[PDB]
């Protein structure tokens, strides 16, 4: 159905995302159990890590377009990522490496992320009808990798330890590189312009130098979230000032702030919703015992099922509005499950969490699948930088919000943790419902401005 390079890109992306989500799924627990962080420390450090992972995506597209070439930067990004995963595995011998290792993942992700999609875009003549389907399959590829990693990495970490888990993340990147190299022959005429001139070693060195500096800056920021806060605050207020000085951009701005709320909520899945599953949900479904950390896999699961269907099935501000209502319902369901449908011992049915994750995934399919894609319909470089910046700010904020559910390590009674989770998830759901209502009210004005 698709060009041959489509399938190479499908599987390269699958394996890269497998490595990344293998880390994401276990990181907060790794912080708590292996490094002895409190749940509060773990949640804010995860927020800082995710913020860097996302905020740096803007750099790799520029590097791929204008410095080294799309295909070259795919290779470089994959190699830096694999190095980062093996460094995380080494951090169990050398704990002092951990932040540098996470910084290497962040930078590797920053270099890599934008480039497979760009490459896939060049596999099709410009108005090919199959593009839409191909990008939906591309999204499924992401979520297939994520589904496997989030399912299996906690199980592996429980049975063999974190060193093996992280080394397997590295191995997944290694085989992403091998399939790229083996299929390199399929994309000989595909690339950005620098791909077809010989590589500038001047620019390669600038990219390696900047990458290394960035790895150390990321390590520092993740270690000192209290100044990462001020960096992103001053960066946000400043870029806000310079956006306000410089009416379709007004639509881009309002949609960007709503996306901020969405990413704040997405950030709860590896932190507060993860520990809610650990502490207040039964760890058995359909008669099988499972690792509760594996519940994070319900996000890619539902996406994998719903992306074809919803591809088969208003317009922009209303699609955003619908997604915000979905997210609101995910957190209201979590709160309701804890308030009314828990056991005498404080444990709730995992079917409630299956439904929580359905709501959050539908929100994702309406909002983030369709965010900078049709923010690109309103618009340049300034807004790409600000988009990734604001989503980074969202992840920092999300870590902070998660800290309201943090549980001291001496608590052992689920009836003590249940009201903390229910209070916070209920308040998140109510605030997000209000945000959805203000969104609904502005949908007509937004839809006019888009004309």
């Amino acid at each position, epitope marked *: 159905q698709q060009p041959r390079p489509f399938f190479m890109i499908f599987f390269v992306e699958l394996w890269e995302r497998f490595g990344y989500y293998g880390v994401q799924g276990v990181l907060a627990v790794f912080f*708590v*159990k292996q490094l002895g962080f409190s749940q509060e420390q773990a949640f804010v450090t995860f927020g800082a890590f995710a913020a860097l992972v996302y905020g740096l995506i803007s750099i790799g597209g520029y590097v791929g377009d204008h410095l080294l070439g799309t295909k070259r930067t795919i290779v470089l990004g994959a190699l830096v990522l694999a190095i980062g995963y093996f460094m995380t595995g080494m951090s169990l011998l050398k704990p002092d490496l951990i932040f540098i290792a996470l910084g290497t993942i962040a930078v590797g992700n920053g270099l890599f992320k934008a480039n497979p999609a760009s490459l896939l875009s060049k596999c099709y003549p410009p108005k090919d009808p199959r593009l839409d389907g191909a990008f939906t399959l591309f999204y499924m590829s992401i979520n297939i990798g994520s589904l496997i990693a989030l399912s299996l990495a906690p199980v592996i970490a*429980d*049975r063999f*330890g974190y060193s093996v888990t992280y080394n397997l993340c590295g191995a997944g990147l290694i085989i992403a590189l091998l399939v790229y190299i083996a299929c390199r022959g399929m994309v000989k005429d595909i690339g950005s312009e620098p791909d077809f001139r010989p590589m500038s070693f001047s620019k390669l060195l600038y990219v390696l130098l900047g990458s290394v500096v960035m790895i150390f800056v990321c390590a520092w920021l993740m270690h000192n979230v209290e100044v990462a806060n001020l960096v992103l605050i001053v960066l946000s207020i400043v870029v806000t000032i310079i956006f306000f000085r410089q009416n379709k951009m007004f639509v881009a701005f309002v949609l960007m702030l709503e996306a901020v709320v969405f990413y704040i909520l997405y950030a709860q899945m590896p932190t507060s919703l993860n*520990f809610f599953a*650990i*502490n*207040n949900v*039964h*760890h*058995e479904i359909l008669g099988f*015992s499972i*690792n*509760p*950390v594996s519940f994070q896999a319900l996000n890619p699961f539902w996406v994998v099922l719903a992306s074809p269907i919803l591809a088969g099935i208003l317009s922009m501000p209303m699609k955003f509005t619908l997604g915000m209502f979905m997210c609101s319902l995910g957190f209201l369901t979590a709160a309701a499950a804890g308030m009314w449908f828990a*056991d*005498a*011992q*404080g*444990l709730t049915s995992p079917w409630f969490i299956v439904l929580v994750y359905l709501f959050q995934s539908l929100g994702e399919l309406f909002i983030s699948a369709l965010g900078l894609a049709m923010i690109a319909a309103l618009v340049m470089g300034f807004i790409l930088g600000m988009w990734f910046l604001t989503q980074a700010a969202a992840f920092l904020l999300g870590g902070y919000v998660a800290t309201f559910t943090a*549980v001291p*390590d*001496n*608590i*052992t*009674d*689920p009836l003590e*943790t249940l009201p903390v989770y229910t209070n916070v998830f209920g308040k998140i759901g109510l605030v997000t419902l209000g945000v959805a209502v203000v969104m609904l009210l502005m949908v007509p004005w937004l839809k006019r401005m888009i004309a």
Partner: nanobody
Amino acid sequence: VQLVESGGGLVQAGGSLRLSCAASGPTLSNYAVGWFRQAPGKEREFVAGINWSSGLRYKDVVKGRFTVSRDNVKDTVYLQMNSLKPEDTAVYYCAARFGGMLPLQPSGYANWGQGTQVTVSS
């Protein structure tokens, strides 16, 4: 996923016994281990436990007599039973649940040892 209990037995009132729980494949370090006991003609009841990060929980009638502790080198959890009394006679089970919580009912725990008879004679 399968726990081995060891260390039960017969003891006189006022004596002591030590139970131990060890896991096979999975590292017990990620698990809250609760000790349950079933006396003749009653249901399994929570006795004592330790979560994955040294939090402790106890039934009222064993406070000041039982101690749960954890040896993370041997990947073993221990229940040290002092000042034993006849009504402590029961089959004892260790049970393991991932994470920091020690729920009170058997249904909160997926993994179970086979049970060790503890008898306290007057």
